[PDB]
Design a protein around this ligand. Structure first.
Ligand SMILES: Nc1ccn([C@@H]2O[C@H](COP(=O)(O)O[C@@]3(C(=O)O)C[C@@H](O)[C@@H](O)[C@@H]([C@H](O)CO)O3)[C@@H](O)[C@H]2O)c(=O)n1
Ligand SMILES: Nc1ccn([C@@H]2O[C@H](COP(=O)(O)O[C@@]3(C(=O)O)C[C@@H](O)[C@@H](O)[C@@H]([C@H](O)CO)O3)[C@@H](O)[C@H]2O)c(=O)n1
Lengths: 130, 128
């Protein structure tokens, strides 16, 4: 009942915004990106330009995948290891459709955007709270 | 529909057998991450020869150890795993598994009888 009602909300009204958005710049180090991931507690970070347009994203899963090189990755830049672009939805998207997208793509956090402009982020956990 | 899927026991939806991610106590961190990738659930158990759970390791745990700045390439899983872990019984309802995952801030959970690993359920599994 409550979950069903929450899934009829627009993501605009449940997404993380402002300082709760994980994002770093294009010149960030991988360690910078990891700190941002840890602090914002969503398992991922965006990589944005100065206008808050999405350049890329990096998840905890991405770290596992890039770690599978023999070389020492500790001083890598984020620009070299990020996923370019990122899966996103419009702010009027219903939570149910965000869930369906996340299920079909096997991701747990989706960017909320107007074109390339990052407005917020929604995590699967957000769709089941409140 | 939503109400029915949420009322299933996790026994009926969990991954079992070869689909369970596990490595042994002597595995390397690289062995552990290979198993995580191969089984596609973002985590692995660490088990003894009787399939008893010693610990777990998740993609989040990799971030936490990597961000210590120590070179982790040659690490052993025994030195970086989380001992113990959160588990549920096979009769746990999907809705209760979801609430547990929410409360513990996790997206995948082991299904066990005591320490005996029976299966694993991902948040994705619960929401088909
Ligand atoms: N069945 C499980 C699953 C996980 N864990 C442990 O719970 C801690 C958190 O698990 P996580 O998967 O690493 O949790 C994260 C985290 O570690 O940051 C992942 C991250 O991508 C993001 O999803 C955040 C948000 O906090 C979600 O609320 O949550 C880890 O030490 C992990 O070993 C456990 O004991 N038993
Ligand atoms: N809004 C998003 C979110 C993620 N991604 C990209 O989609 C890929 C998958 O995201 P993930 O979070 O890394 O997905 C994982 C993965 O490793 O692919 C994480 C893992 O812990 C586990 O949750 C598995 C599922 O078990 C697979 O069903 O799913 C990554 O390259 C990520 O950059 C994206 O483009 N846009």
């Amino acid at each position: 009942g409550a979950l069903g009602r929450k899934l009829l909300l627009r993501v605009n009204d449940i997404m993380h915004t402002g300082d709760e958005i994980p994002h770093v710049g294009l010149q960030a180090t991988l360690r910078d990106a990891l700190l941002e991931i840890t602090r914002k507690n969503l398992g991922m970070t965006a990589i944005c330009d100065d206008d808050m347009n999405i350049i890329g994203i990096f998840t905890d899963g991405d770290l596992r995948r890039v770690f599978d090189t023999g070389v020492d990755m500790r001083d890598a830049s984020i620009a070299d290891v990020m996923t370019r672009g990122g899966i996103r939805i419009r702010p009027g998207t219903l939570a149910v459709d965000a869930l369906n997208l996340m299920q079909s793509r096997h991701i747990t956090c989706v960017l909320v955007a107007d074109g390339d402009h990052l407005l917020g982020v929604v995590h699967m956990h957000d769709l089941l709270r409140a």
